[PDB]
Amino acid sequence: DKPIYTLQYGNVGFVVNPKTVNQNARLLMGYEYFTSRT
Amino acid sequence: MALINPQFPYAGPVPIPGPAPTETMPLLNYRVEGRIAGIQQARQFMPFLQGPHREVAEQTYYAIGTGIQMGQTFNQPLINTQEG
């Protein structure tokens, strides 16, 4: 309904605060977005 | 509009016994003076109201105010250094 443009309203980030982290723990991040030359 | 019989005609009416002539004459009935009695009250506690009514109800309004308008911390855009 409102895409994260992060050029017309600052630098938005994505936060995960974990409770337990094991060894070799990673965070995979899939994205979906538009792109043009405006 | 009867037709006269010429063979058997008749004459006018003859006298007959009568109905006692004063007993067909009435008296003239003699009214006394009259009065709508009592002292009338000025008003009556009526069972229905005497004014108009309304068929439909209309919604009424009253104005209210909002409050003291504050400032804000906007998220501000990036600088147009030829990327935008």
From TrEMBL, chain A:
It is found in: Virion. It comes from the Viruses. Coiled coil: none annotated. This is Major capsid protein. It comes from Enterobacteria phage PR772. The gene is III.
UniProtKB/TrEMBL annotation, chain B:
It comes from the Viruses. One of its GO terms (cellular component) is viral capsid. InterPro entries: Tecti-min-caps. This is Minor capsid protein. It comes from Enterobacteria phage PR772. Pfam families: Tecti-min-caps.
